[PDB]
Design a protein around this ligand. Structure first.
Ligand SMILES: *[C@@H]1O[C@H](CO)[C@@H](O[C@@H]2O[C@H](CO)[C@@H](O)[C@H](O)[C@H]2NC(C)=O)[C@H](O)[C@H]1NC(C)=O
Ligand SMILES: Cn1c(=O)cc(N2CCC[C@@H](N)C2)n(Cc2ccccc2C#N)c1=O
Ligand SMILES: Cn1c(=O)cc(N2CCC[C@@H](N)C2)n(Cc2ccccc2C#N)c1=O
Ligand SMILES: CC(=O)N[C@@H]1[C@@H](O)[C@H](O)[C@@H](CO)O[C@H]1O
Ligand SMILES: CC(=O)N[C@@H]1[C@@H](O)[C@H](O)[C@@H](CO)O[C@H]1O
Ligand SMILES: CC(=O)N[C@@H]1[C@@H](O)[C@H](O)[C@@H](CO)O[C@H]1O
Ligand SMILES: CC(=O)N[C@@H]1[C@@H](O)[C@H](O)[C@@H](CO)O[C@H]1O
Ligand SMILES: CC(=O)N[C@@H]1[C@@H](O)[C@H](O)[C@@H](CO)O[C@H]1O
Ligand SMILES: CC(=O)N[C@@H]1[C@@H](O)[C@H](O)[C@@H](CO)O[C@H]1O
Ligand SMILES: CC(=O)N[C@@H]1[C@@H](O)[C@H](O)[C@@H](CO)O[C@H]1O
Ligand SMILES: CC(=O)N[C@@H]1[C@@H](O)[C@H](O)[C@@H](CO)O[C@H]1O
Lengths: 733, 727
């Protein structure tokens, strides 16, 4: 006699075997009215207005191909499909692959002049079917799919010269992409960055590979640690229409402004404005100063000209520029002005409207909230995501502002489903006539289609009802999203609360931490994760706290840890736990902390703080000292580890110096051996320091795993392993 | 009423006193009385301060070690010691003139010297620096450069490369002076095509970017170093012309393929013996090479080659034994296995193939220790048929049936494990008894074999151990298939056989291993037995040594089979003993023992709850050629590839679901590469096995840093205690 009461919990196996699956609705806009979607491996084309679909491309087309196709890409004109196979992952975004081109009209594979194996990047022009690809660090262009390539660059050299692709740090920390190729709107010009790593030092580490490898391999990666010599960058633009088979291509260099060339600098943004106008943003190595160049194409010269009167300066007195880099501009059609997120006089990030020839911009939004991103720009409206609604920094809604009247702002997503939907992102059609809304929480994910004409809902794309159905009799956790006042400042936290939560009880608590610069761990997003299992099955509250340094709440909070990582952010996680225990439903004796990456650093710094608050903790791929980590991320917040700059705090903020204090806690330290991002080195130095003061701890290396510890088997193993560690620390049987 | 704690073991609360002497002549030896160096008269037992503590107060450096020249005119002082591999290191050197009481300051031994050796008589000095050999006739005079080919990681003159150091000579030096020092013989190793093991070295926290260590290291079936052998006449060295080094080429039977130089032994002033081993180590040849005056060359008569081979295994225990030549060098004695497969002393004439065995029986000679004109002195395990006992015997050369046990009856209850140190001409010997009681060091005179005196009786420790509840040791055998197999147990204090104790099986089980013996040890096992009331057992199964080839060769070509099964069976036999908790049996080992532990835990026997593998081999292709191939042959389709593939711990990953595993490894292990454990962990992850792990940053095979040593044992103790439900 169960009486249909929910007696199921969300278990670890549920998480690891993916029993309860979030359905997505992933589309690709090809026009201003149609999109593509995979139904049952068939590519269906969808008419956005009527909802009717036809099979665009059947799954039973490339079976004869003889290869497993990883992905595809259709040319803007709908005439060719790029088939991506032999995918081999490199870093977070980089990979190599083989490519074939299928003629969608002739219905045949192109067999002449095929894109080579081991291609590093491939991209169609934004219109028609021109191809640019990078192979062996050089850029090639095909005007037609079956025609010989034109080689654009002749200088590419493995690990040294990168043409059209980023090196390690630029991929990870600047562009969040491997691509460094930018086609102009109508595909006339192909702009590209060239990176130079000649004197960048190499991180070297063992890769053991399949057990059949007799001798381990040494992987060597140009990787600049804090203060080390950085890659240099050049920028070019080539006219693809004046290419020739008898003469080499002329790439016109756009040099960085003089303000940048006087020291180490970065290219931090490339954005085409018009057919013949490009904007470049450059960044000083000390990342409080950036210059946007705006460069026009001179017809008679065939060259590019950045008038110093169109240079725009963005700088910060309180910190670095932008959230992680200076924001991207959104140009009006004539390219004579643009909209950009910058922080205002109060430190809040808002949309500023700039004329191309004017220093002072006007802010079109304002308030004690922040604009997250500019999503679309038409001649009448600008569409943007912000956390204004209900003054919740961890919410996200789409708004549109009338360009001719800034007092006329409408929220497009706010009232659609207020209880289920408080975290939206958006996908606009080619000229913003339609948009897909994607709501991520706090309810189950919800994908809907809309016409921007009168903002009416067209249809529900995915409502996750099959999962809703599965979860009916599961004892699921809830989320509490709220704030505490500390030094008259709101600080947000979330708690994943076990089912049938009772404030009379004392629960064990796991502090799930990131706490890196511009991090946000308290939000309205619905997640099915390890925290879900721990609350649902193990009755642990999993809490996260956004303290000083956290993002989306202004620079006063964000810039608070400037030049000072390993301080207030660490301090606020500890204080959070004090506050959490003070709420009366937390077991003071069973409070734990864990994090990955920056969160691993904070976990390690907290556990070594001597606070006495935390019983135990798990650091996964943590930073241990800032000199070990990459220059662009680290120097953004820390400056240079030189005696003239910030070496003292580089030295004061290592986890190693806190080793003695680990005698008070139970510690699990986890690192993948092939971690190219935070090097295994970092945890190897933690372990050695812990051994040297005689502190016992738990450790787990993951052979050949990288920063993600993302292999199917390793993912399952680490979470199983951490689960045992937490259950044991909490005396859970 | 106190027990022997982990801290006791870790902090060496209870020391075993040694009596380390180094003989200086046929009746004098040096002893390091703490700060001082004393010369002791072996005759009278009296001492004078040979070298004071504050003599080198003004030195300004920390002296690692000293070394007196044979004639006693000069002392070599060693400092700036930097360990390399197990035997190899670098050091700075000064020579101190004992006749004058001052440091030599001209033509000094360079910094970063790889090896130094005095000639056997007088004060000539040979040394190796930047892989080349230099000789100093006088300590203050310019050194003569012998070799000009030395090159880091590539050409090694007078020093060994990684594999020869670890697996062949158990030493860094490859320099051999003739008895009166006229000739300097040396080997030359060439690692040109030997592939490099590469691993990360993290170093001090201040190192921004890790270093890649790269070491020429042949894994099983890879390209080996090649070896050449040379002899130089140090008496006719010129300061004008280059030294002429006369090559002795390996025999024709060795030059046919890959081979090793495995032994160098001078017979006389002008006769050197060389032993060479084929890469397939079941065939070796001794060369007897004579100096020719009219030639200036060395001649090795083919009719003087002595072959030593094996049909059931490899040659020697770990390598063919060394010959002990008579004074004229026309005959020699060496240990070889007889027709029953037992290792015994055979007497050879230089010019004939047949030798005569001078010892016989179902026990083995461990080593020849000295030969005089009238007696041959050897150590063996004949006494009471105990392969784990060790005694010194003398065989009357004029009559082989006249064998006297010199140590058997000295203190039969306290002392069953002897080693010995004879004086220059064997006039005296020091006996070292390692157990079963507290170690006892005694001086004797060989003319009448009487005891001169007790040197160190370890009474200071005895008085301390009075207060502690100390564990006992049982050494005994079980019968498996009509064969004795020996085991030892470290039993908790006040052992009650009506009580059930958790058991930990301490394993080595490598070929020629012996873990059951009469030696007194203060170790981790001592603490586990004394404080934790855990029985710690070791078992010598098939593959184990000192019991003949039938047992030792049992695992030939078949590593990870019979010696794995025998540890399992031993544990089954220990459970049938009635005082063992069959719910709490664990297994652990280091190196080969890590391999066997892992193999046992992945066997699916169900016998073991848990275990710890420290720096284990995981598959034989990852380990060095010399050791691995000795037993496994080559990992090729036409040799032993199939068993190489069959004998991995990775292939057993699925069975680790039944046990609790701790896998431990130093990241800078040049010997058993971290790779080996990294492959185990990956295989366990791939089948969804949860286990426990620990890397030791920058630690090598020994995991021997004071702090790492303490951390590993503390970590293992918590693991065993948790496995055993011990609070
Ligand atoms: C061995 O090493 C030490 C240190 O490198 C040498 O001593 C130094 O010699 C240099 C010569 O350039 C002087 O500048 C220093 O005054 C010396 N410093 C120390 C620490 O003593 C030494 O000379 C080297 N060679 C030998 C054979 O002694
Ligand atoms: C938890 N988390 C994340 O989820 C994502 C992060 N980032 C933020 C910066 C851009 C990328 N490198 C990803 N970071 C920043 C970071 C700090 C220190 C060491 C490693 C990383 C990384 N990847 C991060 O900490
Ligand atoms: C326990 N133990 C020892 O105590 C000594 C060992 N040896 C025996 C052979 C000569 C040296 N390499 C030392 N070996 C052999 C060995 C087998 C497999 C992997 C590593 C080693 C090592 N050092 C050994 O296992
Ligand atoms: C995506 C798709 O199949 N497109 C169809 C189109 O072909 C058809 O004519 C129309 C009805 O008017 O509906 C839409
Ligand atoms: C070079 C290229 O683009 N295509 C090749 C193809 O011709 C070949 O059959 C295959 C074998 O590896 O590799 C791919
Ligand atoms: C034919 C032509 O113009 N192509 C040239 C090629 O000849 C030259 O080897 C290379 C060196 O930069 O540059 C490109
Ligand atoms: C534009 C700007 O703020 N420049 C700053 C300067 O004021 C400061 O002295 C230095 C160290 O933070 O970094 C740079
Ligand atoms: C160095 C030492 O202790 N040995 C002395 C020795 O020189 C002396 O001739 C002898 C006289 O009995 O006493 C002993
Ligand atoms: C007596 C002595 O110490 N030296 C001898 C020398 O006479 C002889 O020439 C040498 C071989 O060349 O063997 C030794
Ligand atoms: C089937 C098998 O291999 N078992 C026995 C084993 O119990 C024993 O240790 C060995 C002794 O010779 O003989 C074999
Ligand atoms: C090469 C291969 O197929 N694997 C071999 C297999 O043939 C053999 O039966 C087994 C037992 O020795 O060892 C492994």
């Amino acid at each position: 006699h169960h009486h249909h009461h929910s007696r199921k919990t969300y278990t670890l196996t549920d998480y690891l075997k993916n029993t309860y699956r979030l359905k997505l609705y992933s589309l690709r806009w090809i026009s201003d009215h149609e999109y593509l979607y995979k139904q049952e491996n068939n590519i269906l084309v969808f008419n956005a207005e009527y909802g009717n679909s036809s099979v665009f491309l059947e799954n039973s087309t490339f079976d004869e191909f003889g290869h497993s196709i990883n992905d595809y890409s259709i040319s803007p004109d709908g005439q060719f499909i790029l088939l991506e196979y032999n995918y081999v992952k490199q870093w977070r975004h980089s990979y190599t692959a083989s490519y074939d081109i299928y003629d969608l009209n002739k219905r045949q594979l192109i067999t002449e002049e095929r894109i080579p194996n081991n291609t590093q990047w491939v991209t169609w022009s934004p219109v028609g079917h021109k191809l640019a690809y990078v192979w062996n660090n050089d850029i090639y262009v095909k005007i037609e799919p079956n025609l010989p390539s034109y080689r654009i660059t002749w200088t590419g050299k493995e690990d040294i010269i990168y043409n059209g692709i980023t090196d390690w740090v630029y991929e990870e920390e600047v562009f969040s992409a491997y691509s460094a190729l930018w086609w102009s709107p109508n595909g006339t010009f192909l702009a590209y960055a060239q990176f130079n790593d000649t004197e960048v030092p190499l991180i070297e580490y063992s890769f053991y590979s399949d057990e059949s490898l007799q001798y381990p391999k040494t992987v060597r990666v140009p990787y600049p640690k804090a203060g080390a010599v950085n890659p240099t960058v050049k920028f070019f633009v080539v006219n693809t229409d004046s290419l020739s088979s008898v003469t080499n291509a002329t790439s016109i260099q756009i040099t960085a402004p003089a303000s940048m060339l006087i020291g180490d600098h970065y290219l931090c943004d490339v954005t085409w404005a018009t057919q013949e106008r490009i904007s470049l943003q450059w960044l000083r190595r000390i990342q409080n100063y950036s210059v946007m160049d705006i460069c026009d194409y001179d017809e008679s010269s065939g060259r590019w000209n950045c008038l110093v009167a169109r240079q725009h300066i963005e700088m910060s007195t309180t910190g670095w520029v932008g959230r992680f880099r200076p924001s991207e501009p959104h140009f009006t059609l004539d390219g004579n002005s643009f909209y950009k997120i910058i922080s205002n006089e109060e430190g809040y990030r808002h949309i500023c409207y700039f004329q191309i020839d004017k220093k002072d911009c006007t802010f079109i939004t304002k308030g004690t909230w922040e604009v997250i991103g500019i999503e679309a720009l038409t001649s009448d409206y600008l569409y943007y995501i912000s956390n204004e609604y209900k003054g919740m920094p961890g919410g996200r809604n789409l708004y549109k502002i009338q360009l001719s009247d800034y007092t006329k702002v409408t929220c497009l997503s706010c009232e659609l489903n207020p209880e289920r939907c408080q975290y939206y992102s958006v996908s606009f059609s080619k000229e913003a006539k339609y948009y897909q809304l994607r709501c991520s929480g706090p309810g189950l994910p919800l994908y809907t289609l809309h016409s921007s004409v009168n903002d009416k809902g067209l249809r529900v794309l995915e409502d996750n009802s099959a999962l809703d159905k599965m979860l009916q009799n599961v004892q699921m956790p809830s989320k509490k999203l709220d704030f505490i006042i500390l030094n008259e400042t709101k600080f947000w936290y979330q708690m994943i609360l076990p089912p049938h939560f009772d404030k009379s009880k004392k629960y064990p608590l796991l502090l799930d931490v990131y706490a890196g610069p511009c991090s946000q761990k308290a939000d309205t997003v619905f997640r099915l994760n390890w925290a879900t299992y721990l609350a649902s099955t193990e009755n642990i509250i999993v809490a996260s706290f956004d303290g000083r340094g956290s993002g989306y709440q202004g620079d006063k909070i964000m810039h608070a840890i400037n030049r000072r990582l390993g301080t207030f952010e660490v301090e606020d996680q500890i204080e959070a736990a004090r506050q959490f225990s003070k709420m009366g439903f937390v077991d003071n004796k069973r409070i734990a902390i864990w994090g990955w990456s920056y969160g691993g650093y904070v976990t390690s710094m907290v556990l070594g703080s001597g606070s006495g608050v935390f019983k135990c903790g798990i650091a996964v791929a943590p930073v241990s000292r800032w000199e070990y980590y990459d220059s662009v991320y680290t120097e953004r917040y820390m400056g240079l580890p030189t005696p003239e700059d910030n070496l003292d705090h580089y030295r004061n903020s290592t986890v190693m110096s806190r080793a003695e204090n680990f005698k008070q806690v139970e510690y699990l330290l986890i690192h993948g051996t092939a971690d190219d991002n935070v090097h295994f080195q970092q945890s190897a130095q933690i372990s050695k320091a812990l051994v040297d003061v005689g502190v016992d701890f738990q450790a787990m290396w993951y052979t050949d795993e990288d920063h993600g510890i993302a292999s199917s088997t390793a993912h399952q193993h680490i979470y199983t392993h951490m689960s045992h560690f937490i259950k044991q620390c909490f005396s859970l049987p």
